[PDB]
Amino acid sequence: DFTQMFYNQNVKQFWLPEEIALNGDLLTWKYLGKNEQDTYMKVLAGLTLLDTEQGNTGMPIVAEHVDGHQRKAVLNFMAMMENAVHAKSYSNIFMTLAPTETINEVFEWVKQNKYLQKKAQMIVGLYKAIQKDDEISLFKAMVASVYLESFLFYSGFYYPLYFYGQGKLMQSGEIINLILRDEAIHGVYVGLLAQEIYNKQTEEKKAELREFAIDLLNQLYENELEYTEDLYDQVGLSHDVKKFIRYNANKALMNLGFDPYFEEEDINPIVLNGLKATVEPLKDDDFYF
Amino acid sequence: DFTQMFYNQNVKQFWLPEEIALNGDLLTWKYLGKNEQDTYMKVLAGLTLLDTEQGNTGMPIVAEHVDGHQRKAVLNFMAMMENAVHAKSYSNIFMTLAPTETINEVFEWVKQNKYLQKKAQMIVGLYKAIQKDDEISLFKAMVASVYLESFLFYSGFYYPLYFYGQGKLMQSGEIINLILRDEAIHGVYVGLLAQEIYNKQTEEKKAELREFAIDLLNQLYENELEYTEDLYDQVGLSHDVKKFIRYNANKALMNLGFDPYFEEEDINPIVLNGLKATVEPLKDDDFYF
Amino acid sequence: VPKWIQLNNEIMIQKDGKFQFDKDKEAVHSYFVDYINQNTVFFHNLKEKLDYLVENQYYEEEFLSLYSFEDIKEVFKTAYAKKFRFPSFMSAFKFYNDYALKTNDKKKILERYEDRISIVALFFANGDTEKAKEYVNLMINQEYQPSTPTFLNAGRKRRGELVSCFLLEVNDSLNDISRAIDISMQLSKLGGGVSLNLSKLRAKGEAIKDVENATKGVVGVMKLLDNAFRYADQMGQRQGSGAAYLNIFHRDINDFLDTKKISADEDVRVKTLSIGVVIPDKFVELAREDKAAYVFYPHTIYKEYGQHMDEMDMNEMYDKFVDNPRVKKEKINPRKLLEKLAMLRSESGYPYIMFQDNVNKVHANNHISKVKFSNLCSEVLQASQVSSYTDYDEEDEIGLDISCNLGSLNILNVMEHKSIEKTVKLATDSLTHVSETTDIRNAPAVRRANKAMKSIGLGAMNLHGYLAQNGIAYESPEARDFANTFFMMVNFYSIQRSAEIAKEKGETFDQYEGSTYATGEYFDKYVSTDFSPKYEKIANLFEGMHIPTTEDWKKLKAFVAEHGMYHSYRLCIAPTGSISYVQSSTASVMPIMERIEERTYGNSKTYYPMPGLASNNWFFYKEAYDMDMFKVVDMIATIQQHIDQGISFTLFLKDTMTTRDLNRIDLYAHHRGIKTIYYARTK
Amino acid sequence: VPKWIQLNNEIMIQKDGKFQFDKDKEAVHSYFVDYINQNTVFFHNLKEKLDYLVENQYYEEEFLSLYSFEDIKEVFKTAYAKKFRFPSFMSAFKFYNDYALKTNDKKKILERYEDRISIVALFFANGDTEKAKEYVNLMINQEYQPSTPTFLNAGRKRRGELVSCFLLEVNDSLNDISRAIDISMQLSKLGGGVSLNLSKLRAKGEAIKDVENATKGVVGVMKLLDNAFRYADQMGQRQGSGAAYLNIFHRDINDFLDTKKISADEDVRVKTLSIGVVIPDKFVELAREDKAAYVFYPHTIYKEYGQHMDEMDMNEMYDKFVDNPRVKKEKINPRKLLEKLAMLRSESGYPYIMFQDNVNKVHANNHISKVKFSNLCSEVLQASQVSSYTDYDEEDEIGLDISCNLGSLNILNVMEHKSIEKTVKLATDSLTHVSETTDIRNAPAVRRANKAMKSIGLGAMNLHGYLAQNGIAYESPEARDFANTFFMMVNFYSIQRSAEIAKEKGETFDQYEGSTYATGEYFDKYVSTDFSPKYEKIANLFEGMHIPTTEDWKKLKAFVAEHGMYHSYRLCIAPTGSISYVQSSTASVMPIMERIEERTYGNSKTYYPMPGLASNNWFFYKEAYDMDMFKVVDMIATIQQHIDQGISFTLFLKDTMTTRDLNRIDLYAHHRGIKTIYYARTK
Numbered sequence A, B: 001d002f003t004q005m006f007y008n009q010n011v012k013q014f015w016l017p018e019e020i021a022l023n024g025d026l027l028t029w030k031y032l033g034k035n036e037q038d039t040y041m042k043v044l045a046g047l048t049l050l051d052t053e054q055g056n057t058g059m060p061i062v063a064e065h066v067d068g069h070q071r072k073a074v075l076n077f078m079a080m081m082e083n084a085v086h087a088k089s090y091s092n093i094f095m096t097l098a099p100t101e102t103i104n105e106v107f108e109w110v111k112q113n114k115y116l117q118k119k120a121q122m123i124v125g126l127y128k129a130i131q132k133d134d135e136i137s138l139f140k141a142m143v144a145s146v147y148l149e150s151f152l153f154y155s156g157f158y159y160p161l162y163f164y165g166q167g168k169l170m171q172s173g174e175i176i177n178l179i180l181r182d183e184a185i186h187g188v189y190v191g192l193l194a195q196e197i198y199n200k201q202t203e204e205k206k207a208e209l210r211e212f213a214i215d216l217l218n219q220l221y222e223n224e225l226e227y228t229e230d231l232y233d234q235v236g237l238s239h240d241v242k243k244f245i246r247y248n249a250n251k252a253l254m255n256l257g258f259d260p261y262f263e264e265e266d267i268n269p270i271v272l273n274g275l276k277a278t279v280e281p282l283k284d285d286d287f288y289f
Numbered sequence C, D: 001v002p003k004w005i006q007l008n009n010e011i012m013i014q015k016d017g018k019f020q021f022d023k024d025k026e027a028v029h030s031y032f033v034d035y036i037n038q039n040t041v042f043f044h045n046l047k048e049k050l051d052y053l054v055e056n057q058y059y060e061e062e063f064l065s066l067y068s069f070e071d072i073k074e075v076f077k078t079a080y081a082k083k084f085r086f087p088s089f090m091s092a093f094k095f096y097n098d099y100a101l102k103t104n105d106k107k108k109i110l111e112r113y114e115d116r117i118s119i120v121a122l123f124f125a126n127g128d129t130e131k132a133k134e135y136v137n138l139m140i141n142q143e144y145q146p147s148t149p150t151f152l153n154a155g156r157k158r159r160g161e162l163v164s165c166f167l168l169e170v171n172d173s174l175n176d177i178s179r180a181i182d183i184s185m186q187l188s189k190l191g192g193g194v195s196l197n198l199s200k201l202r203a204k205g206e207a208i209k210d211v212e213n214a215t216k217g218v219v220g221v222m223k224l225l226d227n228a229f230r231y232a233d234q235m236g237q238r239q240g241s242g243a244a245y246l247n248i249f250h251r252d253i254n255d256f257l258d259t260k261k262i263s264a265d266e267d268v269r270v271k272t273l274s275i276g277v278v279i280p281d282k283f284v285e286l287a288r289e290d291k292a293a294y295v296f297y298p299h300t301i302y303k304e305y306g307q308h309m310d311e312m313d314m315n316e317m318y319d320k321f322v323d324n325p326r327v328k329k330e331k332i333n334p335r336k337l338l339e340k341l342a343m344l345r346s347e348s349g350y351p352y353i354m355f356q357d358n359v360n361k362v363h364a365n366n367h368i369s370k371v372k373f374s375n376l377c378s379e380v381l382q383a384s385q386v387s388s389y390t391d392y393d394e395e396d397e398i399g400l401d402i403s404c405n406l407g408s409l410n411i412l413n414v415m416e417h418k419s420i421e422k423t424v425k426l427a428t429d430s431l432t433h434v435s436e437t438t439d440i441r442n443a444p445a446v447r448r449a450n451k452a453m454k455s456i457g458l459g460a461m462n463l464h465g466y467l468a469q470n471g472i473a474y475e476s477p478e479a480r481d482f483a484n485t486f487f488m489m490v491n492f493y494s495i496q497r498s499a500e501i502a503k504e505k506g507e508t509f510d511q512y513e514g515s516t517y518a519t520g521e522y523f524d525k526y527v528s529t530d531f532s533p534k535y536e537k538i539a540n541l542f543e544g545m546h547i548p549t550t551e552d553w554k555k556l557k558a559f560v561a562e563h564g565m566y567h568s569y570r571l572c573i574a575p576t577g578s579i580s581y582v583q584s585s586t587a588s589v590m591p592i593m594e595r596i597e598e599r600t601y602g603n604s605k606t607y608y609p610m611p612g613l614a615s616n617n618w619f620f621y622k623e624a625y626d627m628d629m630f631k632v633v634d635m636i637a638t639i640q641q642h643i644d645q646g647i648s649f650t651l652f653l654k655d656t657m658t659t660r661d662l663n664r665i666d667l668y669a670h671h672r673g674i675k676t677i678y679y680a681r682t683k
């Protein structure tokens, strides 16, 4: 009942980072403190890693196991967006704002950062555990994918949105909003596929799947807290970002058909402001008048 | 040396089925004989069936085994074009020209056809034989992929190009020309990835891979001749189609860095009508000797 | 935003559900109160103005020296006594932006409308003060408008040539091709549009000195010509404009046409070279009967028969070409070729269509040559003889290359003044003067044909404007009746003036004795058919003017027999692009494309309603795209029966109609006697 | 695969760790016993062969009619008495594929090597049987090789022109530009490579009669010439090759260079027209001192001084140009321009570099004109006077457009036969005959310069082959000593033959009296410096031959003063691309690119070892890319000191080296007196 409308929405949302000129951010970037620039680079690098794996691994593997040519076409399109559009856009931002050495250093930093490695290990592990014709392993990977789309990106998205909302780094911010617009529909779509599998189960099996989903969310959440503190303490925003990730965790649960898990909190209003002609043959009667 | 350049060329060639209005083809379709309509339907179904294998298996399997983030992104983009763009385009052409019952029957016929099946299963067999961390099996699959993209499609493309060059079925011919333009670049790109593997091999292993490629080409070519007579004798075109197959076989070989196998031939004119050194500054005292 | 631009944009603002057309008039006042008068250079007297313009190399001394200063002052006073006022803002804007003489720094205005008209009149009269005053009264009444070259450049030292339509014949040789490229460059340097006939050139895959598959065809020549026209672009002012014409029976016709396809490669497509196709009646007969046609290799035909393929009648030669084994040919489907022409015209408006037999069945100078091709605007249809440009230090055989002299009657102004005869005769005299004063030293055949043929083109404009302001629909039979009568009178007085000039000077055009004027055949339909209006409304429109009858035409035929005719060609209806704005007229005899046209100049928007447009005549000012193209073809054929040359006939199509409709319009034009089809503009 | 192809491929199959060079010989035998002898057309006697070739329009009958058939039979018998055998398969293959005469359908071979040599000798002798036998002995011994046009086309009815290269001066006018395009097409039709000097054309943004920023610059003319050369492509057989030369002080020099950038847009990129840059010593001086230079607008300089910018010495007029406010100029960085030249040569091998002051400090005909540009191979350096092509019906002022006939001495065969003098004199006579029988009817300046200058080009081939086969390293000082002595001998005997021809004909070349030959200045370094070999090995190599001393040079100087010189220019070392294969010689005086070259013909691959390559001389056949370019520059300068025209000097670069290394090589070449640099080929 939904794939065709998602197909149409995904293809109509198609974009490339080159559509957005980035040289306009040069001055507002220059004006940020060293702490702010550091957090910003690292935040986008963490996002780049997530999209790299979502494009290389997550979306293609889910596409492989989901039945139906139209469902596969949507998932293939989403996969392309992840690595050919989203992951690449971050390099466009980096290449504009930062010198090569700072770019090299931040990519080295992703490799050695323990929270980023842990979250990649956990998510990719679940993708690679999918067994052919085994719907339960597929469900588990789809939960992981929804958590990546609708929860994990948000510790990263906070900062570009926070600046956009203050009228700073607005070209980079425009790119990020386009990425966010895509991930929102990706999270909903994968959520609907996960619910399909969940709804086939016995009540006992469903109870176990909810346990899996909630245990996984809590494990990812605890790691994301440490990641958030590590990045945001130097810019004074860790508590604010934490409220934002809890907000989005609830959206991820809802995408999976589950009740919200965290209590509602006031999000920084700045971040909320951050959001040929037709041819006929000639008849013999056309030659006479 | 080449992936970013191909990335650029691929994304700038992006298109959607909806861009070409198909209904005006009915004004020339109605004037074709039964044999012409039959051949066109059968050719179209042949292309559709082969392209589906490439979208569901060929491109995604190669993307899975190739190392490199940028290569995986380009390959993902190509897989997207197969599944999201090409497949919808073929379906659109069919739905415009034939009623539902006729489409189902043509696909039943072509699905049972000996020559279409022989080539489809030969290609799919090589994709299924790729082994993790074995570059030889990957190379063999890449050869199969290049043969599909740059050679096997062309016994089929001939007919729409033949009409397109005569002013008939111009809307569907425009679509086919866009598809063909994508398959050409797909073939060239996968060809470069195959040459990379080939160049890492010993001289004895190279000679062995050359023998594999020529042997495979021979098997496919002999089946193409039979496929060609089966479809085109009823419309009197087989001689010229055979010249077009050999010409495209030579292009496929050149994509794989191999010499042409067949002597140069001229192609049907109607179908033709359808178709840095390191900069180092002068340091002074370079003017004195 | 300037005040006049606001007053002009206030037209679209609707008051009481009606457009504020009168506001445009106010805009003109502003455009003169705020801008034109402020930036117009004024002198203490006309003597100082003329001295300043002559000394600063603005004017020419020769044409002003033919008059005493008193006569020049009297001519200027006659021009200024009319107190002419531009009725619309766009008229004055177009004149003072395109035609008014400006200083070298382009910040001040040296010439008003009256000054330019007086200078052009003094140039026309060539020393006759009374004739100069007659020309001034003709142009200040806006009855006659010299073409953009003549109007802009007459009397100016820093100027191009007064002729901008040039037709070149290219012979099948490398020397002739190089000479054609050189002449095209020289004529584009002069500011003229150059049309080249490529039918005599041998097709691709022909022999050069008995070596096979050597010729590049006409497409390589088109690439060379396109590069030449890109290079010669009026000293970097306007884009170099050229046209290439090929016979449809030339084998390269597809590749020719392939130069205008969007899918064509960079080594195939020519961008600044317009293309036209000459379609003999034989091709239309072959397409009609669905018989497969043959496109011939011109060099094989030349070797077999000693004459070029386009130099003989294809109607009687086609069967002999097909049955001749020594003539090489390729099988084509004429209906497929017609569909390709229609598709190409839908995509880009190309090629121009020349119906060879429609032109040549009424051509008066077939003895000199049959009309093989047309101009860049597809309205000049004249006899041309190819030139044999030999090697160096060898005498060339200079032929005839067409270059006619443009000038347009304003039908509304001419008919409201009841001065068809006087305006036609004065326009003919001015065109004769400009043709006689044209001397091109780098185009030998153009100069020879200008001296010999003395061909001029007298056009008409504001046909739709006149009809709409008189409550007549352009597609109505009354409009065609008016066009028939008006253009028959124009032809009558043009022939009378040509014969009078021949009698006065004692000379006719070269090879006149073989023309149908000399034999009296041209006057046949005029001595047997009465062209008086068949409707009472049109007759009342022609009230106060003598309409030539059959007896008058017999007298004119006898006069031409006794005295000859000075001009080989007299009438051709040019598009009249920008001069129609200055004259506040609709362009050519074409119907209007839009009732109010929106234009963007600089960063400002401007609005030009069609002349005389109001609430009462809003319905009569029907847009061309909404009109039935068959009735437009009927009107253009009605006019063409009185025009010796062609009419720039643009088709106006909707996006809904297909290539079958375009082909039907083309075939109905061929059936109705249309000589040329200019453009296929899709809305 | 053919048997000879397998035998030739057997060379690379090593036996006992060594290449099987002798297998190559076997291949030739196969190539003759299986293909050539079967595909040859044999007649009963020579009479039937000559009659068949004459009546079937293969041979011109005029040159054969000057001899009785007995004399022609004697000449052919002299040619066949040598029993010439091709030592390598590729020599015979190249002759019988590119130069042997075939039938109209190219299915059989009508001309053997001896037949072709006999026909060329009979054409050269012009009725002298003994001279024809001398030419036969000279060519069958392979001491002298006429250029590809002369060797291929001599005595043929379907021939082109015997002149290889043509150099045109283009004046700054539309008429001159169009004439240059026409002449370029005519000469490319004749098969010759055309070089055009665009330095007189005014730059982009110049005024065409008081309207400023109007010119398209040299880039528009470049596009026109590129399209002209594309169109005139030897009837589609060989791609039309043109060269454009621009002075480095021209304002368009950057845009010029931008025509060869791989990122250039289609409206600027030119792909079939080679580019050359003429660098005066002033530019090198400015770059050396790092002082910002000025490029100039040619039209402003012409207006101020009455002469073109390239018509006068920049070394003395650059400061006057800079300090003159009426001269328009743009600031450039000469070092940045040099780096751009190096980058362009690394990317594409363009531009050609012509060191103008190096050419003109030893140019013997500076009185006629300074050398302002070179040919398509950058070895022809002669005086040229620009032509004033005026309007039609106006007389044109015909200047001098360079054109010389090429012919190469085979150094190995000449020195083996100890016949430097005889070979040089006979080659000079043959080139004089080729010049005399050359008459081009569509290039007037070329014809006048051929008639007046009488310039010929006598080159040399197999320098590296001779050095490697004699155990001399090409970079060694002994090799440079040999080149010095050999080319001093060649210059001495060429001057002697030119003076003897002037004496026997009683005429010198036009304006010889003002040349350095007439004043005796040319012989200065020859009457004070001894060019005998300084090494015993080279002296032994020259044994049996009288090496001219200062006394012989003084006698020759007196002889020239008494009688004059027939040829303005005598020696030019062309690349000698494909005719070096037939002679079994290394290309020109350049070092070999590779010891064994793998070339793909049809679907087969062939390996050509360098002539005389073996185990004992493997390392003497050092590849050019492995050589120090500074020592190659030293060799080329040593040869150039005895060559009046230039030498096609190709730079052979490694991929590792930077543009700074290329700039250093260029500056060392300029320092050492190198006149021109041909190509920057990167391995």
Ligand SMILES: Nc1ncnc2c1ncn2[C@@H]1O[C@H](COP(=O)(O)OP(=O)(O)OP(=O)(O)O)[C@@H](O)[C@H]1O
Binding pocket: C028, C029, C032, C033, C037, C084, C085, C086, C087, C092
């Ligand atoms: N519509 C117009 N077309 C042409 N010129 C105009 C127009 N309106 C004003 N002008 C110019 O501005 C001048 C001022 O004209 P205005 O309407 O103020 O009254 P006027 O009685 O015609 O004036 P004047 O004393 O100048 O003759 C005119 O003489 C004329 O030169």
Ligand SMILES: Nc1ncnc2c1ncn2[C@@H]1O[C@H](COP(=O)(O)OP(=O)(O)OP(=O)(O)O)[C@@H](O)[C@H]1O
Binding pocket: D028, D029, D032, D033, D037, D084, D085, D086, D087, D092
């Ligand atoms: N390398 C070669 N170059 C030129 N011609 C050759 C060559 N090899 C063979 N031929 C030609 O093919 C013929 C084959 O004869 P071949 O050389 O085998 O010796 P032959 O029969 O003993 O006679 P001869 O050597 O005296 O001509 C030769 O006479 C010659 O015309």
Ligand SMILES: Cc1cn([C@H]2C[C@H](O)[C@@H](COP(=O)(O)OP(=O)(O)OP(=O)(O)O)O2)c(=O)[nH]c1=O
Binding pocket: C189, C231, C232, C233, C234, C235, C236, D171, D172, D173, D174, D175, D177, D201, D202, D207, D208, D209, D210, D214, D215, D216, D217, D220
């Ligand atoms: C006509 C024309 C000339 N040119 C350039 C190229 C020529 O080298 C240069 C000279 O043209 P000319 O033919 O000499 O023009 P001209 O003689 O009328 O002007 P002037 O008196 O100043 O010499 O102008 C263009 O670039 N484009 C053009 O269209």
Ligand SMILES: [Mg+2]
Binding pocket: C172, C173, C174
């Ligand atoms: Mg000819």
Ligand SMILES: [Mg+2]
Binding pocket: D172, D173, D174
């Ligand atoms: Mg000039």
Ligand SMILES: [Mn+2]
Binding pocket: A051, A054, A081, A082, A086, A087, A179, A182, A183
């Ligand atoms: Mn993403």
Ligand SMILES: [Mn+2]
Binding pocket: A054, A078, A082, A149, A182, A183, A186, A187
């Ligand atoms: Mn996503």
Ligand SMILES: [Mn+2]
Binding pocket: B051, B054, B081, B082, B086, B179, B183
């Ligand atoms: Mn596809």
Ligand SMILES: [Mn+2]
Binding pocket: B054, B082, B149, B182, B183, B186
């Ligand atoms: Mn594909």
